[PDB]
Amino acid sequence: QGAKKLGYKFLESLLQKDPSEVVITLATSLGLKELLSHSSMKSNFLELICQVLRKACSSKMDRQSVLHVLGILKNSKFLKVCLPAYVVGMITEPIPDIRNQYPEHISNIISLLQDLVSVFPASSVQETSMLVSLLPTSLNALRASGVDIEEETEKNLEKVQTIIEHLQEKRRE
Amino acid sequence: QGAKKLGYKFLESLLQKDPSEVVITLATSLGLKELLSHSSMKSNFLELICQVLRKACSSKMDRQSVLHVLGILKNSKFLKVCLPAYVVGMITEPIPDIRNQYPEHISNIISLLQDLVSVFPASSVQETSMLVSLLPTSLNALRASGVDIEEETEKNLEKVQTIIEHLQEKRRE
DSSP: OTTTSOOHHHHHHHHTSOHHHHHHHHHTOTTHHHHSOOSSOOHHHHHHHHHHHHHHTTOSSOHHHHHHHHHHHHTSHIIIIIHHHHHHHTTTOOOHHHHHHHHHHHHHHHHHHHHHHHHSTTTTHHHHHHHHHHHHHHHHHHHHTTOOOOHHHHHHHHHHHHHHHHHHHHHHO | OTTSSOOHHHHHHHHTSOHHHHHHHHHTOTTHHHHSOOSSOOHHHHHHHHHHHHHHTTOSSOHHHHHHHHHHHHTSHIIIIIHHHHHHHTTTOOOHHHHHHHHHHHHHHHHHHHHHHHHSTTTTHHHHHHHHHHHHHHHHHHHHTTOOOOHHHHHHHHHHHHHHHHHHHHHHO
């Protein structure tokens, strides 16, 4: 029933399942493309979608489903427009409660970036480059505004930055 | 007559006029909004539009027309989606002739950013912040790939970065 027009409550219930169930539910869902086809979205819905995609694409068992989900993710307005706009919108957030919760979503975004640079390195260069170019600015803005960042998050961002830099360098020629 | 449905040839002819004529033609054109409502565009058309906006919004005579043109520009998909993607696409350009022409369009983009941060500082913080966060990466990529950058361009980008940083700082509280 709701396995097509994936709603907020449906994804909330689906997140509790194990990564295999989540990735197989998303890969066989018709509305996944329509789920990520929004350039504008609420913060809560975007964070839930990022959590669900982080958990699903981490499935070290269902390669074809992760492939399908990441292939839909890389060509979606969610990754191209919505996520960069949200990362930029982190800088002008006055409320401290949301600024303190931002690091978890940043970690989820960096994990999805690693997934993209490992599964679709050649065709997802532009989107991952835009996101890894926008992330350090919001990280410095949150670090200066009291919000602490986990060191592992910085390590992962530097790793994905190195991979993306090498892919851009090898595409320049 | 043909001043609506702003086409490539119309903007090519209009660019030769003085800044007052250009800005008044754009402000009184119905299709201006529909001209900038494209998230995807050709390189030549985007560069022509950026040149036209640089020349028009430089008009130190017609304040109302510059206000209208910049107000349409700040809320358009051209500035939100098209220009950041175009700036990111500079890094993976193999052709050297286009990489060598990029600095002029970068200077035009920085000039439009100065226009936005001086005319609409409060409401255009997000869009100008995304572009001033994406520009130094493509500048480093072009500087490493042999393409030289003008010193005045770097000065202007650092100035607009300082203004945007202070606006974000004053929006955090």
